[PDB]
Write a protein that holds these residues in place. Structure first.
Motif, PDB file in Angstrom:
ATOM      1  N   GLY A 147     -38.161  36.356 -10.807  1.00 50.07           N
ATOM      2  CA  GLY A 147     -37.408  35.330 -11.630  1.00 50.07           C
ATOM      3  C   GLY A 147     -36.372  34.632 -11.003  1.00 50.07           C
ATOM      4  O   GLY A 147     -35.762  33.570 -11.626  1.00 50.07           O
ATOM      5  N   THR A 148     -36.157  34.492  -9.712  1.00 47.84           N
ATOM      6  CA  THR A 148     -35.368  33.608  -9.061  1.00 47.84           C
ATOM      7  C   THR A 148     -36.186  32.383  -8.400  1.00 47.84           C
ATOM      8  O   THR A 148     -37.133  32.486  -7.466  1.00 47.84           O
ATOM      9  CB  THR A 148     -34.349  34.343  -7.717  1.00 47.84           C
ATOM     10  OG1 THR A 148     -35.432  34.411  -6.560  1.00 47.84           O
ATOM     11  CG2 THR A 148     -34.165  35.633  -8.273  1.00 47.84           C
ATOM     12  N   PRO A 149     -35.795  31.277  -9.143  1.00 45.68           N
ATOM     13  CA  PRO A 149     -36.557  30.020  -8.675  1.00 45.68           C
ATOM     14  C   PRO A 149     -36.584  29.860  -7.064  1.00 45.68           C
ATOM     15  O   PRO A 149     -35.709  30.293  -6.393  1.00 45.68           O
ATOM     16  CB  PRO A 149     -35.982  29.010  -9.271  1.00 45.68           C
ATOM     17  CG  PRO A 149     -34.678  29.431  -9.881  1.00 45.68           C
ATOM     18  CD  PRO A 149     -34.861  30.804 -10.328  1.00 45.68           C
ATOM     19  N   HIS A 183     -40.541  30.036 -10.491  1.00 49.11           N
ATOM     20  CA  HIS A 183     -40.151  31.430 -10.376  1.00 49.11           C
ATOM     21  C   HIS A 183     -41.557  32.297 -10.778  1.00 49.11           C
ATOM     22  O   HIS A 183     -42.203  31.563 -11.459  1.00 49.11           O
ATOM     23  CB  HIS A 183     -38.956  31.719 -10.995  1.00 49.11           C
ATOM     24  CG  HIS A 183     -39.164  31.746 -12.651  1.00 49.11           C
ATOM     25  ND1 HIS A 183     -38.861  30.838 -13.410  1.00 49.11           N
ATOM     26  CD2 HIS A 183     -39.604  32.749 -13.465  1.00 49.11           C
ATOM     27  CE1 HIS A 183     -38.937  31.342 -14.719  1.00 49.11           C
ATOM     28  NE2 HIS A 183     -39.775  32.318 -14.602  1.00 49.11           N
ATOM     29  N   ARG A 233     -30.305  32.248  -6.951  1.00 50.18           N
ATOM     30  CA  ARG A 233     -30.118  33.500  -7.645  1.00 50.18           C
ATOM     31  C   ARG A 233     -28.732  33.475  -8.652  1.00 50.18           C
ATOM     32  O   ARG A 233     -28.819  32.537  -9.526  1.00 50.18           O
ATOM     33  CB  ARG A 233     -30.054  34.679  -6.777  1.00 50.18           C
ATOM     34  CG  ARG A 233     -30.397  35.927  -7.566  1.00 50.18           C
ATOM     35  CD  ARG A 233     -30.061  37.294  -6.503  1.00 50.18           C
ATOM     36  NE  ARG A 233     -30.738  37.137  -5.290  1.00 50.18           N
ATOM     37  CZ  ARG A 233     -30.802  38.000  -4.371  1.00 50.18           C
ATOM     38  NH1 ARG A 233     -30.256  39.219  -4.684  1.00 50.18           N
ATOM     39  NH2 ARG A 233     -31.805  37.647  -3.126  1.00 50.18           N
TER      40      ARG A 233
END
Ligand SMILES: [Cu+2]
Ligand SMILES: [Cu+2]
Ligand SMILES: [Cu+2]
Lengths: 353, 373, 359
Positions: free
Chosen positions: C97-99, C57, C77
């Motif tokens: 921030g979402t892998p 992320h 998410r």
């Protein structure tokens, strides 16, 4: 005084026989105290009767004010070409990147326009892009090679050198008597409006961005103040807005308290016509005019949404609204002994000095 | 440590025998690493019981949190004075330029307030504008000359030199037991449902709402700007964590929020993973720091962070989370952790191990968010 | 040239024998000229067939465009997980921030993806956070003490060191036929849209933030221009948008009129540079720019246009020429020439936006 700009701080970008354009320097150049308003530049344009201002688009959102005389502003949008008839007191927003040209309609008096620009992309720096002329103001077309212009316009090279490689008079040229006649969600007149403050000591006209969508895109309020001779604008401060005031006509003087400039802070200037002084948010400022003539000053209120003028002195004085016990502990004096100071005045905002 | 601020990083702008106001330095002064919260400043106000804080207004949006004791906050606002009686765990929004004064309505418990400020002009810098006072505090009326103040409020010059030359004790002065009783007698404000939420203007009872995360090992109270009128203007979430002794707030990271955590009471430590500084990618630098009351540590967005409480007593941290809208709180350990949701074949390639060696790593913690230390 | 970035301005943050990720430098590094896009970074990802990109992320909003190959993007998410199969010309928004991990599911074509990143914390800088890795894709779990990881994960110390230390092959690793298992709102296929401008000399595809929501958060329009050989994209300027153009394929050159590098009272510096695959050039707001394709093959350009709301494409030549709209009187005093003489040079081009150009 970092908060005061006289004539020596301007820079003439346009200078011709029939007109001139003065551009104020960046507010973050002299001192970092005006770290805000860094992405705002101030420009002054004046022109002779029956003259023409060459068309150009800017790298900035443009809002202007008509200080003197009449004019015809023509904006060229997508296909639609809008022409607006303006007068002394009108306010028009020119969206960034659109081309705009204007003329001075009137026959004898001049034409004064106060422009404020919010640069897009690189902050603090804007430029005018000229699409006409090859020597006087070079057409950005001349920055291209001939092969590109020949291919794009499908025009002979020598014909391009002829059309652009002429005109050396000015970005502000004179016009024939007939050409002025032919050219003569819209403009907003600030003077022809119910004053927010009305008394014999002053007339305050303001246009808040909530009322007009033209100013909402920039979050900027334009306000004009006509001060009676000898009168004063009482000490006050803005809740959130920073005041960029320019003197249109008259003399006076202003004072301001700045905790940044002290020895753990007297700031004042003489204030004559053509001087810009910045009043930041929360800074107590008071404007006083001379007893000889009026003081017509134009103010630009950046960050206007949510602003609330707090008068340090007047009918709605912020201090006499306290509780009776709080005034005692603050000044270390009995209540009635200090209650009388702020109860004496009865006028609003404008006072005599 | 670039993310840890201790006592030497604070400036005592107010110094009185009855209280003090320590203002944290700018986050840019040390390094540009904390550039995301450059336009934010911190403050901590301490005050003895039965005292008075002089009225003033700030060139910044102020959001203060009462971390210890009870007080009565009064704001003048726009031609309508409003006063609020707040206790422990109350969030109060003070608009920029709005004057405000408050007292310490307690007999023996001193006040302790944490302020976060957002300048509206010059970023990262603010000053207080005291309207009443002579020396300490200094009133801005003294900057104007006598000739202008004379024609301002119909008052002689020698009459002004007596009022603006009396107060000199400070901005935090002592008060009699009735003056405290007068202000704390009635709070001024429109009727609101209780506990005070974010549907209407006024204080917020942060500790009176159900925790977003709660078990034996800790509790997390938070107020998001999405459903809070007082905080929506700032896009700032206020959070509070009561980590049980010997417990820890497990490794997690914010999706886009930058956390400005202030330790209110307790002892512990925190660890954070930072790729930005790592001695040139040799390996992750173990950013650890001891945590006590008065220590402020910042965790920039995207950074895994874990807060461990001491074995002796609980650790209670106040969190200021900037850029809170759209922010998701991803946990890296425990129930519903993010690394667990990966496809099985993706974990085999990522770790280079078979599924038998990695799967139950992120599946072997029954608790959520809060775990033993 | 401050507006042109060659391969010497990129820095490879991922470099394995199955793929690499070249990251463009900061636009404000050399000069303070490109300050309008200081909070934007560019990155190019190439990957061999049947390879895997390790999950990570970013502390930045991510909008990626697939320039070549087949792939599938997997995001996790809020609790649930989505996996979109994408091909040539897909636009995928990835929240900060979402892998996200992905693979090149094609058996021969290399996967080329053009990323644009808007940092959500410190402006102009970002980092990739690898959670599932070992040594080379260094997991951020290694930054915590074993006593902390043991208590939070409830896993023994010896097993934690065995897992967070094995992988050392890098971020892009070959995957053998487990592709089919790892591939079995939403993307925006830009090439499948109707071109805003289309003639024989070029096609212009664009995805405006006002029509796609996903881009609306960044105020970022994604555009594509397939310019025919020898032809050109005529001189024009954006009313507000700053364009960040990336040459996907082909050769050519571009010219721009910049009054900031004038070094004169009111001039326009001639900004020009040759275009080839991998060159990035930036055209700030209000700057007249013209792109010309090579006479041999076409020139295909991907454009990230920051500040796209309210933006207008003002053309300086062609059908919708902005100067032609002027009134005949205004044309005369501006050029100081008779109105009849100046009209011929702006009405002589019948085509729109795209024109030929060979000399
Ligand atoms: Cu100041
Ligand atoms: Cu970091
Ligand atoms: Cu330029």
């Amino acid at each position: 005084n970092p908060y005061v700009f006289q004539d020596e701080h301007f820079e003439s970008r346009v200078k011709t026989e029939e007109g001139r354009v003065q551009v104020l320097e960046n507010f973050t150049k002299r001192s970092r105290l005006l770290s805000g308003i860094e992405n705002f530049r101030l420009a002054i344009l004046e022109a002779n009767p029956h003259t023409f201002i060459s068309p150009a688009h800017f790298d900035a959102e443009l809002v202007l004010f008509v200080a003197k005389g009449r004019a015809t502003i023509t904006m060229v949008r997508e296909e639609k070409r809008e022409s607006f008839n303006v007068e002394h007191g009108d306010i028009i927003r020119i969206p960034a990147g659109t081309p705009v040209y204007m003329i001075n309609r009137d026959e004898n008096e001049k034409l004064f326009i106060v422009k404020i620009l919010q640069p897009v992309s690189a902050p603090g720096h804007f430029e005018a892009f000229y699409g006409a002329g090859g020597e006087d103001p070079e057409s950005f077309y001349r920055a291209f090679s001939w092969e590109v212009l020949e291919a794009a316009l499908k025009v002979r090279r020598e014909q391009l050198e002829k059309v652009f490689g002429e005109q050396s008079k000015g970005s502000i040229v004179k016009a024939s008597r007939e050409k002025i006649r032919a050219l003569s969600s819209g403009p907003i007149n600030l003077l022809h409006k119910h004053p927010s403050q009305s008394n014999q000591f002053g007339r305050l006209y303001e246009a808040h961005p909530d009322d007009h969508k033209q100013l909402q895109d920039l979050d900027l309020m334009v306000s004009f103040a006509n001060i009676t001779k000898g009168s004063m604008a009482g000490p006050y401060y803005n809740s959130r807005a920073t005041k960029i005031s320019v003197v249109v006509e008259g003399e006076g003087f202003f004072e301001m308290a700045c905790p940044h400039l002290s020895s753990s802070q007297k700031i004042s200037a003489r204030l004559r016509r053509g001087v810009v002084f910045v009043a930041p948010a929360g800074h107590p400022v008071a404007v006083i005019a001379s007893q000889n003539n009026n003081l017509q000053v134009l103010c630009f209120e950046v960050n206007a949404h949510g602003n609330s003028r707090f008068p340090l002195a007047g009918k709605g004085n912020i201090v006499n609204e306290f509780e009776r016990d709080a005034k005692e502990l603050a000044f270390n004096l009995p209540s009635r002994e200090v209650e009388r100071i702020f109860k004496n005045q009865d006028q609003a905002f404008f006072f005599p000095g």
